[PDB]
Amino acid sequence: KNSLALSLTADQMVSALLDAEPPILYSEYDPTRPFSEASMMGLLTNLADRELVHMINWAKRVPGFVDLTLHDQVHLLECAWLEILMIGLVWRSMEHPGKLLFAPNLLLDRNQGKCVEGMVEIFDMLLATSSRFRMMNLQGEEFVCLKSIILLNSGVYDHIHRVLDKITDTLIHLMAKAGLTLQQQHQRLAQLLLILSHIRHMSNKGMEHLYSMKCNVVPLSDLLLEMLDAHR
Amino acid sequence: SLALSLTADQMVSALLDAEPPILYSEYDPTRPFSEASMMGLLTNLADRELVHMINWAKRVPGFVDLTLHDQVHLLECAWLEILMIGLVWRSMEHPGKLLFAPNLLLDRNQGKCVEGMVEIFDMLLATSSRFRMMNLQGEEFVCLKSIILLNSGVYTFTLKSLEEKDHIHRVLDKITDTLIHLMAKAGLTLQQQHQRLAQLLLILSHIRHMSNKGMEHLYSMKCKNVVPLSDLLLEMLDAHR
Amino acid sequence: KILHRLLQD
Amino acid sequence: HKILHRLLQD
Ligand SMILES: CCC1CCC(=C(c2ccc(O)cc2)c2ccc(O)cc2)CC1
Ligand SMILES: CCC1CCC(=C(c2ccc(O)cc2)c2ccc(O)cc2)CC1
């Protein structure tokens, strides 16, 4: 009945999350700069589909997650998958201001973000979030904590709550290790967590966008359709 | 700025006295129960609440330091979030119930409209259940509501004028300080302060989600010519496309 | 806008 | 029966 997650130390939690990390996947090696609606969403759908398989196996390595019933695991993944994809996208796009690094061989700018009604708004939001993470000097150890929080929190409505508290402890532990003052710790903690509200917003808007693409642009995988249908 | 000058206690006092009143609905038990008339009551109620919210926002420390265009944007972005956290707050002492108004207590059964609406209803109930279990304080609630106003649209915004976004970040940091101050005064340990702070802010993610899903229904509503949406509510709604 | 007008009052 | 159910198993 008792979860191993809570018995982990802060450094153990960090290492577990770092080790659970999915790899950065590549897009198609077709040299063409995507501008068409079909071409760009074709590349993004294919990429996200492959990322999802890694995400699912990543989630099972998040401490506390496998302690949940299978149906709860399903629920949390259906709720948070686009949030998790997006914060990953935003993270690896940090060192590329004004651009989004969907893949090492697929960097898109706002100009490609046009051409389709409903993208450039969400595109601009992703860029602002990336720029925000960059200015805060978000660390990889902080990033994996936030991503895990998103997984456990987004569809949470006792065990999850204590695991969430544990991750909070881990974040503070990281900032304290980084030499931050106590004031800087709770301030930075607040700043990070408020960005999760924007990530939630971007996911919801993005999900609307995907349903529109669904109702016949590019063929979706059965997995993507089911993850999509989960949001009604 | 005057906001960056206020102490944590002065910040709390400012927010408390800027609190809007709890408005009544036009609900009548002797009237029939058209879940489109429930939305009638809520729309009418929300519209009258918006007027108080706008004047409340102007008394939120640091808000009127911003341009009119930025004030408009933040309110357009956050209005339903702010209505919903207010709803959830006043529904705390009513398990299984939402207190839309003192004369309007609805549970999920006197219902509705359903699949989707009952879902939003359930989410609101869950959030209220969370505030109650956390024993959310009035001082903490007014901090959270003010954070939503400033944060929900702090991105999503010309050139040069960008230090206004910096100013919003400064005010948000102050409200963070205020929250911690309240928890420290409440006798919570350092670990308990950080944890409660996190718990509170993670709830804002849920409030954001409920607002977006609620906005979808209101747009779905509008196009079906159900409720007669008021002029202001129509303009606030069109902001979210 | 109505909102902009009410914010000016 | 969702694909997610199968994948979460193995
Ligand atoms: C502004 C356009 C926005 C659309 C949604 C996004 C997607 C996305 C996000 C993160 C990734 O690593 C990979 C893909 C996406 C695109 C298609 C799809 O079938 C599923 C997810 C992010 C970009
Ligand atoms: C589950 C139903 C859900 C619908 C959206 C909510 C509304 C709401 C929220 C908070 C209030 O104090 C007053 C009204 C609402 C209803 C109609 C409208 O035109 C604008 C806002 C909250 C409840």
Identify which of A115, A55, A112, A106 has the alpha carbon closest to the alpha carbon of residue A81.
A55
Question: Is B53 in contact with B20 (CB distance < 8 Å)?
Answer: yes
Q: Give the resolution in Å.
A: 2.2
D5 in contact with A at a CB cutoff of 8 Å?
Answer: yes
Secondary structure percentages of chain C, helix, strand, coil, to 5: 80, 0, 20
SS3 state of residue B35: helix
Which DSSP category does B137 fall into?
Answer: -
Question: Is B148 in contact with B85 (CB distance < 8 Å)?
Answer: yes
Strands A106-109 and A99-103: antiparallel
Identify which of A150, A122, A124 has the alpha carbon closest to the alpha carbon of residue A206.
A122
Selected residue of D1, D2, D4 to mutate for chain A interface (largest A Cβ count, 10 A):
D4
Paired tokens of A161:
């709550």
* Residues on chain C touching B69 (C-beta within 8 angstroms): 4
Q: Mind listing the domains of chain B with CATH numbers?
A: 1-241 (1.10.565.10)
Q: How was this structure determined?
A: X-ray
Paired tokens of B8:
């944590």
CA A209/CA A118 separation, integer angstroms: 7
Question: Is A147 in contact with A55 (CB distance < 8 Å)?
Answer: no
Amino acid at B42: L
SS3 state of residue B54: helix
CB contact under 8 A, C2 and B51: no
Q: Cα dist. B205→A64, A203, A230, B124, B167 in Å?
A: 21, 11, 19, 13, 22
Q: Cα dist. B138→B141, B145, B204, C8 in Å?
A: 5, 11, 16, 29
CB contact under 8 A, D7 and A56: yes
* Residues on chain B touching C5 (C-beta within 8 angstroms): none
